[PDB]
From Swiss-Prot:
<feature type="binding site">
    <location>
        <position position="27"/>
    </location>
    <ligand>
        <name>ADP-D-ribose</name>
    </ligand>
</feature>
<protein>
    <recommendedName>
        <fullName>Non-structural protein 3</fullName>
    </recommendedName>
</protein>
<feature type="domain" description="Macro">
    <location>
        <begin position="4"/>
        <end position="163"/>
    </location>
</feature>
<feature type="binding site">
    <location>
        <position position="115"/>
    </location>
    <ligand>
        <name>ADP-D-ribose</name>
    </ligand>
</feature>
<comment type="function">
    <text>Seems to be essential for minus-strand RNAs and subgenomic 26S mRNAs synthesis. Displays mono-ADP-ribosylhydrolase activity. ADP-ribosylation is a post-translational modification that controls various processes of the host cell and the virus probably needs to revert it for optimal viral replication. Binds proteins of G3BP family and sequesters them into the viral RNA replication complexes thereby inhibiting the formation of host stress granules on viral mRNAs.</text>
</comment>
<feature type="binding site">
    <location>
        <position position="116"/>
    </location>
    <ligand>
        <name>ADP-D-ribose</name>
    </ligand>
</feature>
<comment type="subunit">
    <text>Interacts with mRNA-capping enzyme nsP1. Interacts (via C-terminus) with host G3BP1; this interaction inhibits the formation of host stress granules on viral mRNAs and the nsp3-G3BP1 complexes bind viral RNAs and probably orchestrate the assembly of viral replication complexes. Interacts (via C-terminus) with host G3BP2; this interaction inhibits the formation of host stress granules on viral mRNAs and the nsp3-G3BP2 complexes bind viral RNAs and probably orchestrate the assembly of viral replication complexes. Interacts (via C-terminus) with host NAP1L1.</text>
</comment>
<feature type="binding site">
    <location>
        <position position="117"/>
    </location>
    <ligand>
        <name>ADP-D-ribose</name>
    </ligand>
</feature>
<feature type="binding site">
    <location>
        <position position="35"/>
    </location>
    <ligand>
        <name>ADP-D-ribose</name>
    </ligand>
</feature>
<feature type="binding site">
    <location>
        <position position="13"/>
    </location>
    <ligand>
        <name>ADP-D-ribose</name>
    </ligand>
</feature>
């Protein structure tokens, strides 16, 4: 475990993370994809061997000894708000199981279903609250990665509100 488990947020490419493992915002078919998924494919392509997994699940594949946890959030274009909310919560619970199983002291994580799977809606708060619900019982240092300057401020505010 971390000596004083924390949450942090950084605005940069998650392919440049300084953590012991990464969470990919994966598609269900293990394809290179776009956004975070394409960055992850360029950095850790070996981790896409048999990485296909259903919506609401996570599947870990090692790139050398570096664990890539492929977490499949729902595409809100296809799911109802109700069913998508349930699957997005479930993907983060499976991430927390994997982080625990791996025994890592730190994990880099993007906000699932906030980009091309958002169905064109702002889901920062919805996705971050499901992240906290899953990760709060883990003792890994969590570092959240984002690309937008205003999202950085809002994620940082939400972290500091609870401390
Ligand atoms: C830049 C912004 O506000 N974002 C985050 C970005 C990754 O994607 C989005 C989206 F698909 C739908 C609504 C908002 C956003
Ligand atoms: Cl960067
Ligand atoms: Cl997405
Ligand atoms: Cl972002």
């Amino acid at each position: 475990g971390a000596m004083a488990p924390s949450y942090r947020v950084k605005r940069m490419d998650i392919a440049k993370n300084d953590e012991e493992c990464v969470v990919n915002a994966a598609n269900p078919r293990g394809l290179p994809g776009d956004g975070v998924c394409k960055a992850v494919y360029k950095k850790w392509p070996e981790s896409f061997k048999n990485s296909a997994t259903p919506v609401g699940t996570a599947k870990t594949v090692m790139c050398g000894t570096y664990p890539v946890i492929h977490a499949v959030g729902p595409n809100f274009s296809n799911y109802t708000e109700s069913e998508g909310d349930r699957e997005l919560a479930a993907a983060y619970r499976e991430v927390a199981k994997e982080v625990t199983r791996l025994g890592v002291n730190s994990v880099a994580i993007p906000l699932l279903s906030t980009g091309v799977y958002s169905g064109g809606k702002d889901r920062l708060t919805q996705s971050l609250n499901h992240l906290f619900t899953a990760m709060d019982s883990t003792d890994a240092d969590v570092v959240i990665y984002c690309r937008d300057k205003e999202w950085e401020k809002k994620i940082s505010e939400a972290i500091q509100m609870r401390t």
